[PDB]
C-alpha cells in the first residue's frame, strides 16, 4: 500500500532524516494557522493524493500570505485532484500540507525498491534530481548509480559513502548523505517496505541535504507485522469497489470495455480477457474468484462488476477447483437469478461434470448461455455486444 | 520426469490445518508415498493413518522422507522452511500464499547456499502423473506423457494440461515455480531440468507480466534448450503498475510487459501462441 | 568483562526474562528493608562477587526473618568472600542481593557462548541443571544438546522448540522455553555478548521457567559502542594492578614466583615465563608492554612488577618493536634508576643495535646484567633468586 | 613462496593514518609493490608519492591492486573490510587489534561465501623476504630461505624467525594468522599451502593458549601434511580462564591448554620443542 508524502516525512523524521517542517491540514483553518506555527514565508502548500505528478497539476504552490493559504485550501479541499498517474476521476484531496519553503542548491534523486532480478534490495543515486528517473535511466544511464543491500551484513556505510562520491557530494555532505542512505536502509528492512523515492533530495544554499518529497510503499502481505503502517492506510485513495472485492476474496480492477469478466485464478483471468480483446471485444474489468465459486461469492462478484454502466455483458470462465461444475453451474444460476442480471451472460465451465452443468445452464430458462470451449465463448460474448 | 517420481517419501508441514489435511488425502489416495507431517505440539499422535512429529528433524530420523510440502500460514513460513533447510530435506514444495518478500529473499539465499530446492511459494505444486501428486491441483485431468510444463499461474496451467491430455500427449511433470516476486526456482531452473529428462520430449512454458524471468529463459532457452517449447504469456490486455492478483503480476517501472515477453521468447525462436486454447495445437506442429 | 548475577538479572528483565522478585542492597538496613517490599518469606540473600561457587562457600542462604537478614547483611559487606574461583583473597561484597524464595520443581541448564571451531553462536541446553557443566559433558554428553545461530538469518523459533523439546518440555513450558531462546540470543547479539549462563534455569511448583541465577561476560573489545555495558564495570573485583597497567597500555597478571617478566608481545612474554619455568624459574607474573617501551612506560611496568613482595629479580626481554636496542638500553637505565630498583635486573636485548644496546647496559654501574641470549638471561635470573 | 611476491600490487586502507604512513613508508623501501592507498574524503591527493582514493573500487579501477592492507581503528574495520570483499579485492591483511568478535563472525562467512583471503585480524603480517612485506614486522632479521612459518603471535614469532635464519635456512614466507578467537585463516588453510609451495621445505607453527585450532592442525598435518613440521606453543605457565594479552589467548571450560595442544602435536608425529630457543635446532634435525 501507498502512503502520502506527509506521512513519508513523519516516518522519515522518526528515523532522524531532514525534512521541512510542516503540518498536515484538513480545514482552511488549520491550513492558515500552520503559517505562523512554521515561521516566516513564504511557505509551500501541497495537496495530498497518493499519485505523483500533483506539481504539474497545480497541486503544489508557494504561496505568500495566510491569505493565500486559505485561499488554497479552500479550493483543493473536498475535490479530486488529476494528475498523469490518475484515472480522469483523480483523487480526493482530504489533506493540504503547509510546509517551510527551502533554499535549492542542488536536486538529487535516491529511491529504493526490491529488484527481482538480482533478488536483493537496491538503492539508486542520481544528479539529475527532480526528473522522472525513468527518462533519466534510457537517456542517460551513466547518471544512475546502485548499490545491492547484503542480505548477510545489512546495509553499510561504505556503500552509503560509495554513492556520495558518485555524486560528487564532499565534506560534511558526505557524512550527512551516508547517515541518510543508512537510515532509509534501516527503514525499509524494518518496516518491510516495497517502494522508496526521495525525489528531489536537495541540497540546501545553506549546505544541508534535506528530503523535499518522499514516496512509500509497503509490502502488503507483511502488514500482519506492520502495526503502524497498517493504520496508515487510505482507502479515500483507491477504487472502492477494489477493497469490497478483497473483503469477499475476490480481486478486482476497473477498466474501459463492455465486457466483464469472473475468472478464477490471476492468470487464467487475464488470459480470459486477452482472448475476449483477441475476438475483437473490450474488457471491462479484472475480476479473479479467489474462494470457492459460492452462490454468495459469485453474487457478489456480479454484484460489482455489474456496478459499471458500461458492462453490457458478462463472460464467466470457471476450470475445476474444489467443486464440481454442476455444483458450480447452479451457483451461478441461483447467483444470476438473484441478482437479476439484466444484460446476456455467457459461461464457461471445465473440469469435473463440465457437460452436465453445462445442460443444467442451457435449461436454466435464464439468459445464460453455456458456450462450448473457451474460443467459442469468447466469440459468443462479443457477440452479444 | 523430474524432481519427483512414484518413490519421493514425503512428509506435511502443517499437517493437521485444514488445508494440510484436505490435500495430503487427496495425495494419499492418488498414491503419493505420504510417510508422515509435522506440527508443533502434535507429535507422537497419528493423523490420516500417518504419524505425526513436533519436529521436521524427528519425521526425518524416522522416515528418511527426502520432501517436504509445506501448507503453513504465511506468517511462519521462513521459520518452517528453515527448519526444513535445517533437518537436512532435499526437496521443499510450499503452497502457502502471502509470504513477505523480504522473508523469500532471506530463504532464497539459503536454499543456495545450502543446495536445497524449493518449488513455490505460491504454487498449485508438482505433479508426475501416474507417479506423484503434491499440491492442490485436481489429478483427473493429467495423463502420463511426453510434455513438461512450467508455470508462474495456477489454474491457467490446467488448461494446457487438458489440452496436452486431450491431444494424447499427456505430460512428464508439471512445474509450477508460483506467483510471488522471489520465487524458489525460476524459469531457467526447471527448464535445465526438462532438457536432461529423456521422457520429456517438449515443454511448454507458461508466463504473465511482471519481471523479467521470461526475457532471461528466452536468451537461455536459445542458448541451451534442444527441445521444443511453445510459449503463452498471459497480461496483454492488463494496466501497467496494478497487482493483477498474484504478487508478482505487475508490471514496474514500465518493465516486464507481455508483448515485451511474447517478442523476446520468439527472437529466441521459441514456437509462441496469443491464444490459450492453442497450446495443444502448436505442441502438435511439433 | 563480567557482570553481577544482580546485574544480569535486571537485563534479562528489560528483555521480559522471568527472574525472581528482588533487590540490590548496599547497607544491611536496605537488606531487611528489601524483605516486606518482596512479599511473605522465606528469602533469599546472596554475596554478589563475580565469581561463581558462592553457594559452597556459604555466601548464599535461604533466612526466615527480618533479623537474620540484617545479620547476614552485616556479617558479609566489606568482607571478602573466597570461592573455588577466586584467589586467596576472594572478591569485596559491596552488594547483596536479597529475592524471593522459589519453589523448584525441576532445574535446567541453557547457556551460549562463541564456539571458536565452528565460528559460530552456540548455545547448550540440558536438563542437568545446578551442576557444574563441564562434568556433565565429560560425563553424560548426551544430555547436553546444541543449536548454533545462523549469522544470515538470526536466531529462529524452531531452534528454541528444539531444545525444549530434547529437555522433555511439552505445553506452556515449551512456548516459555522458545520465548527465553529468542530473548536470550537477541541480548547476545545486540550487546556483543561473550558468555551466557543460566544455571539453573528452573521450573516451579507452579509450572513456570524462572532464571533462578545468571551470569554475562561482555566481549570488551565491544565496549565502544556498549554505553550501558560500559556503565556496569566493576572495578573492585579485579586485581587492581591489572586497570592501572592497562593506563599506561601495559597488560598484566600476577603469579606466584619470585622472577617478575617484562616482555615486549603477548606470545613472547608467555614464551619467556616458560623458558625461565624450563630452566628451575618460578615467573612472577605475566607483564606484555603494548606501547613503545620509552622510559616513561617501563618506568610504570618496574613499579607494578615490584609492587609484589616475592618478586626477587626481575628478567627484562625485548625483541625489536619501534625503537632502536641503544635507545631503549637507555630507557631501561633511566627507569631502574629513576624507580631504585632493589634486586637483580636481568636485561635480553635484541634486534637492531643489539650489541651497542647491551654494552650501554653492561656500563650502566647499576645492577644490571646483561645477557647474551635468551637462555642465557633464563640461566642468570633464575641464579640471581 | 604462498600469498605474496615481488609482483603482487598492494593498496593501503588508512593509508593517511599514523601507522598506515609509518609502515606503507617501511613497505615501499623493503621493495613491497604498493601502488596507493584509500582514505574515504581524501581522495583525489596524493602521499607518499602514491595515489589516494576515496574508495577500495576506484583504487582498483585504477592500479588493478589485487591485494589490501587494513590499518583502519576497530570500530570501522567490519566496514572496510567488507568494502574490499566488494571492491575484487582477493588477499586482505588486517593489522587491526581490537575488532568485536561477533564483527569477524561476520566477516568470515562472507569470506569464505565470496572466496576471498584475509589473514588477521590482529597479526604483525605477511612477508616473503627478499620480494614482498606487509606488515609492521622487521625485515632486517629475514632471509629468503627454505622453512616457512605460520604464527598466532608477533614478537614470538620473530625468535623463529632469527633462528632460521641464523642457521641459514631462511624463509619463504612468514604468515602471522593474528591472535583474535576467529582469525581470517587458521592454521590449516595456511598449512595446506605450504605443502604444494614447492620453496618451503619445512614448517615451523608457533602456537598458544586458547581454542583449539592447534589441536585439529594435528590431526591434518598426520593426515595430509608430508614435509616435516617443528611446532612450538607458549602458555604452559598461563593460569585457566585468564585472557593473557591477546583476545585469543585464554583457557575457556578448562579446555585448550598448552599442554593439551604440545600432546596432541606429538601424537600426529610432529617434533614439539619446548623451549622457543631451540626451534632453530629442532630443524636442523631435519
Ligand atoms: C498455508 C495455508 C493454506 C494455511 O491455511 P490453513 O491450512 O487453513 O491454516 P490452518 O490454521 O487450518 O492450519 C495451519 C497449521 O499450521 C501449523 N503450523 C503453524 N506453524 C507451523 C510451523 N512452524 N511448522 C509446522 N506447522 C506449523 C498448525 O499446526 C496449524 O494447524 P493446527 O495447529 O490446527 O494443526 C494458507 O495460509 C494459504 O497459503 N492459502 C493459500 C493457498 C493458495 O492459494 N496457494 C496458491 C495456489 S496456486
Ligand atoms: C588500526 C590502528 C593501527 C590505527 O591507529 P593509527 O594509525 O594511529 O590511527 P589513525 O587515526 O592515525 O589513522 C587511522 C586512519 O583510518 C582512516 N579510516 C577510518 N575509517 C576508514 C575506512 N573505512 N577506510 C579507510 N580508512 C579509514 C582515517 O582516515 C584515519 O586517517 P586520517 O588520519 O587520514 O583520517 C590501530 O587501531 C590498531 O588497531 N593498532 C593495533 C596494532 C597491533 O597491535 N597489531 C597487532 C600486530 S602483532
Known amino acids: 500500500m501507498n502512503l502520502h508524502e506527509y506521512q513519508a516525512k513523519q516516518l522519515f523524521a522518526r528515523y532522524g532524516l531532514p525534512a521541512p517542517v510542516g503540518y498536515a491540514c484538513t480545514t482552511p483553518r488549520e491550513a492558515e494557522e500552520a503559517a505562523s506555527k512554521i515561521g516566516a514565508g513564504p511557505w509551500v502548500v501541497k495537496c495530498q493524493v497518493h499519485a505523483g505528478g500533483r506539481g504539474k497539476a497545480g497541486g503544489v504552490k508557494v504561496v505568500n500570505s495566510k491569505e493565500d493559504i486559505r485561499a488554497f485550501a479552500e479550493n483543493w479541499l473536498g475535490k479530486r485532484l488529476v494528475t498523469y498517474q490518475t484515472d480522469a476521476n483523480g483523487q480526493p484531496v482530504n489533506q493540504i500540507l503547509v510546509e517551510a519553503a527551502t533554499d535549492i542548491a542542488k536536486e538529487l534523486y535516491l529511491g529504493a525498491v526490491v529488484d527481482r532480478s538480482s533478488r536483493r534490495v537496491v538503492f539508486m543515486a542520481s544528479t539529475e534530481g527532480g526528473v522522472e528517473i525513468e527518462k533519466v535511466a534510457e537517456e542517460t544511464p551513466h547518471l544512475i548509480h546502485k548499490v545491492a543491500l547484503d542480505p548477510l551484513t545489512g546495509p553499510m556505510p561504505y556503500q552509503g559513502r560509495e554513492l556520495a562520491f558518485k555524486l560528487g557530494l564532499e565534506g560534511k555532505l558526505v557524512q550527512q548523505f551516508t547517515k541518510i542512505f543508512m537510515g532509509l536502509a534501516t527503514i525499509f528492512l524494518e518496516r518491510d517496505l516495497a517502494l522508496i523515492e526521495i525525489n528531489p533530495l536537495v541540497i540546501t544554499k545553506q549546505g544541508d541535504l534535506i528530503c523535499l518529497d518522499g514516496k512509500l510503499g509497503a509490502d502488503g502481505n507483511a502488514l500482519f507485522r506492520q502495526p503502524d503502517l497498517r493504520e496508515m492506510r487510505d482507502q479515500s485513495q483507491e477504487d472502492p469497489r477494489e477493497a469490497q472485492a478483497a473483503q469477499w476474496e475476490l480481486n478486482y480492477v476497473a477498466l474501459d470495455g463492455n465486457i466483464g469478466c469472473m475468472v478464477n485464478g490471476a492468470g487464467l483471468a487475464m488470459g480470459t480477457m486477452d482472448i475476449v480483446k483477441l475476438h475483437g471485444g473490450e474488457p471491462a474489468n479484472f475480476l479473479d474468484v479467489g474462494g470457492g465459486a459460492t452462490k454468495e461469492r459469485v453474487t457478489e462478484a456480479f454484484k460489482i462488476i455489474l456496478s459499471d454502466d458500461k458492462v453490457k455483458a458478462v463472460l464467466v470462465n470457471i476450470f475445476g477447483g474444489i467443486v464440481r461444475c454442476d455444483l458450480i453451474a447452479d451457483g451461478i444460476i441461483g447467483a444470476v437469478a438473484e441478482v437479476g442480471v439484466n444484460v446476456p451472460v455467457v459461461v464457461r465451465l471445465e473440469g469435473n461434470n463440465a457437460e452436465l452443468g453445462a445442460k443444467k445452464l442451457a435449461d436454466s430458462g435464464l439468459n445464460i448461455i453455456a458456450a462450448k470451449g473457451l474460443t467459442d465463448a469468447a466469440q459468443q460474448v462479443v457477440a452479444a455486444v | 520426469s523430474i524432481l519427483i517420481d512414484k518413490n519421493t517419501k514425503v512428509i506435511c508441514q502443517g499437517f493437521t490445518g485444514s488445508q494440510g489435511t484436505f490435500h495430503s488425502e487427496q495425495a494419499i489416495a492418488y498414491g503419493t508415498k505420504m510417510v508422515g507431517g509435522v506440527t508443533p505440539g502434535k507429535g507422537g499422535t497419528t493423523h490420516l493413518g500417518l504419524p505425526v512429529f513436533n519436529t521436521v528433524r524427528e519425521a526425518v530420523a524416522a522416515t528418511g522422507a527426502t520432501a517436504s510440502v509445506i501448507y503453513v500460514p504465511a506468517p511462519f513460513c521462513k521459520d518452517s522452511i528453515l527448519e526444513a533447510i535445517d533437518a537436512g530435506i532435499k ?22 547456499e545450502a543446495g536445497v530446492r524449493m518449488i513455490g511459494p505460491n504454487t498449485p505444486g508438482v505433479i508426475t502423473p501416474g ?22 499461474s495456477g489454474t491457467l496451467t490446467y488448461e494446457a494440461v487438458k489440452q496436452t491430455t486431450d491431444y494424447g500427449f499427456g505430460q512428464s511433470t508439471c512445474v509450477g515455480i508460483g506467483g510471488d516476486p522471489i520465487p524458489g526456482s525460476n524459469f531457467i531452473d526447471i527448464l535445465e531440468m526438462f532438457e536432461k529428462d529423456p521422457q520429456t520430449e517438449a515443454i511448454v512454458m507458461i508466463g504473465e507480466i511482471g519481471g523479467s524471468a521470461e526475457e532471461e529463459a528466452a536468451a537461455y532457452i536459445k542458448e541451451h534448450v534442444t527441445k521444443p517449447v511453445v510459449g503463452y504469456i498471459a497480461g496483454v490486455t492488463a494496466p501497467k503498475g496494478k497487482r493483477m492478483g498474484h504478487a508478482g503480476a505487475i508490471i514496474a517501472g514500465g518493465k516486464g510487459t507481455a508483448d515485451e515477453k511474447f517478442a523476446a521468447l520468439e527472437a529466441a525462436g521459441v514456437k509462441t501462441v496469443r491464444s490459450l486454447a492453442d497450446i495443444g495445437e502448436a505442441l502438435k506442429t511439433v
Open chain 2, 91 to 112: 526437496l521443499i514444495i510450499t503452497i502457502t500464499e502471502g509470504i513477505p518478500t523480504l522473508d523469500m529473499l532471506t530463504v532464497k539465499v539459503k536454499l543456495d
Open chain 2, 131 to 152: 507417479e506423484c501428486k503434491i499440491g492442490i491441483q485436481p489429478g483427473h485431468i493429467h495423463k502420463p506423457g511426453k510434455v513438461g510444463i512450467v508455470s508462474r
